[PDB]
Amino acid sequence: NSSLPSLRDVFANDFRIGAAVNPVTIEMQKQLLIDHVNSITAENHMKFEHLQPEEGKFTFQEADRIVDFACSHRMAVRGHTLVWHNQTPDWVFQDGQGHFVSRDVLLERMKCHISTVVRRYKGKIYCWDVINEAVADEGDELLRPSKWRQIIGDDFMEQAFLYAYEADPDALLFYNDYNECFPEKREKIFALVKSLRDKGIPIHGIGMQAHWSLTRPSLDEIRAAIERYASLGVVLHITALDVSMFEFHDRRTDLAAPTSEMIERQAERYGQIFALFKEYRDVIQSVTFWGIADDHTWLDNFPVHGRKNWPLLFDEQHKPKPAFWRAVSV
Numbered sequence: 001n002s003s004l005p006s007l008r009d010v011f012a013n014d015f016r017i018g019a020a021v022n023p024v025t026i027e028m029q030k031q032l033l034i035d036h037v038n039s040i041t042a043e044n045h046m047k048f049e050h051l052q053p054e055e056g057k058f059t060f061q062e063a064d065r066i067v068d069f070a071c072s073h074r075m076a077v078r079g080h081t082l083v084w085h086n087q088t089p090d091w092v093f094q095d096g097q098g099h100f101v102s103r104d105v106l107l108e109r110m111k112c113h114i115s116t117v118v119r120r121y122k123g124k125i126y127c128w129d130v131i132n133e134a135v136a137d138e139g140d141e142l143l144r145p146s147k148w149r150q151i152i153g154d155d156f157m158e159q160a161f162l163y164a165y166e167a168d169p170d171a172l173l174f175y176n177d178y179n180e181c182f183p184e185k186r187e188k189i190f191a192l193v194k195s196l197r198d199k200g201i202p203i204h205g206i207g208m209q210a211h212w213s214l215t216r217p218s219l220d221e222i223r224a225a226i227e228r229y230a231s232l233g234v235v236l237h238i239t240a241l242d243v244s245m246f247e248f249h250d251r252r253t254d255l256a257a258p259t260s261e262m263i264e265r266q267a268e269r270y271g272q273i274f275a276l277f278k279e280y281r282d283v284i285q286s287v288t289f290w291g292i293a294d295d296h297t298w299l300d301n302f303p304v305h306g307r308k309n310w311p312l313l314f315d316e317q318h319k320p321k322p323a324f325w326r327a328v329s330v
C-alpha cells in the first residue's frame with residue numbers, strides 16, 4: 001500500500017469515494033477506510049429499526065460510533081435511510097389494538113422520527129436518503145406497495161422530504177433506489193422525481209444504488225440513466241456500488257473462489273464503470289461502494305444465503321484486485 005494509489009485522491013477532482021460500514025467492519029477494515037475513502041454510510045445502523053426500535057426509545061449508539069469515526073478522519077457521511085418499506089418496526093404502523101394507525105398519526109410519527117434523527121446529526125451528515133426504494137421493481141404500477149403508502153397515501157414521500165428539509169435545510173435530500181438503470185424502472189424513477197420537483201418538493205438528488213453484475217446493466221443503460229436523471233437538475237450519487245460475480249439467474253453455491261475469467265471480466269467491468277463515471281464528473285458528486293473489501297459483503301447471503309461473492313476492489317486479505325488497477329487508471 002505504501003506506493004498504492006489512494007482512491008479518494010485519485011478521484012479528488014471527480015467525486016468523493018465512500019464505503020458502507022458498521023462498528024464491526026470499521027475495526028476489521030479500519031486501515032483500508034483510512035487510506036482510501038472520504039465518505040462513510042451506515043450499512044444498517046441508521047435505518048429505522050436501529051434508531052427507534054420502540055416508540056420514544058432512540059438507540060443512537062452504533063450510529064454515533066460510525067459518525068465519530070468519520071469525523072475523526074475528516075470523512076463525509078451519507079445518512080441512510082429515513083423512510084423505507086424494509087427494516088422498519090411494526091409499532092410504527094400500529095396502535096394499541098394492533099390495528100393500523102391513521103394517516104395523521106403516521107405522519108406525526110414520521111415527522112418525529114425524521115426530526116429527531118436529522119437534528120442529532122445536523123452539521124455532521126451532509127445528505128440523507130429520505131425515501132428508499134418506493135418505486136415498484138416489477139409490474140406496471142409506479143409505486144411499490146408499503147404500509148407507509150397504504151396508511152398515508154401516495155403523498156407520503158412529499159411529506160417525508162418536507163419534514164427532512166425542515167429538520168436540516170442545508171442537507172441534500174435524496175430519493176435512493178436499485179435497478180435504477182433498467183429502462184422501465186428508470187422511467188418510473190424519473191417520472192416520480194420529476195413530479196416531486198414540479199411540485200416544489202425539496203428533493204435535491206437521486207441515489208443510484210448500483211448493485212450491479214458483470215453484465216447488467218449495460219454501459220449504454222448506465223449512460224442513459226445518468227443523463228436522464230441529470231436532466232432533472234438534481235445531483236447524482238452512486239450509493240451502494242458492487243459488481244456481483246453472479247447474474248440474477250445464477251444461484252450456484254459450489255464456487256469456493258471466482259474463476260480467472262470472473263476476476264478478469266470484473267476488472268474490465270469496473271474500469272468501464274469508472275471511465276463512465278469520470279466522464280460524468282459534472283453531475284456525479286459521490287461514489288460509495290456497499291462495503292470495501294471482499295471479506296465483508298451483504299452479497300455473501302443475498303440473494304443466495306450461505307455462499308461467497310467477491311464484488312469489491314480489494315480481496316479478503318485487503319489487497320488490491322485487478323479491478324482496483326483498472327478503476328484508478330481511467
Ligand SMILES: O[C@@H]1[C@@H](O)[C@H](O[C@@H]2CO[C@@H](O)[C@H](O)[C@H]2O)OC[C@H]1O
Pocket residue numbers: 178179209211212216248
Ligand atoms: O432487496 C434489494 C435487491 O433485490 C436489489 O438487488 C436487485 C434484485 O433484482 C435484480 O434483478 C437486480 O439486478 C438487483 O440489483 O438490491 C437492493 C436490495 O435492497
Ligand SMILES: O[C@@H]1[C@@H](O)[C@H](O[C@@H]2CO[C@@H](O)[C@H](O)[C@H]2O)OC[C@H]1O
Pocket residue numbers: 043044132178209211240290298
Ligand atoms: O447487512 C445488510 C445490508 O448490507 C443491506 O443493505 C441494503 C443493500 O441494498 C439496498 O437496496 C438497501 O438500501 C440497503 O439498505 O440491508 C440488509 C442488511 O442485513
Ligand code: NA
Pocket residue numbers: 013014015280281282283284285286
Ligand atoms: Na463530480
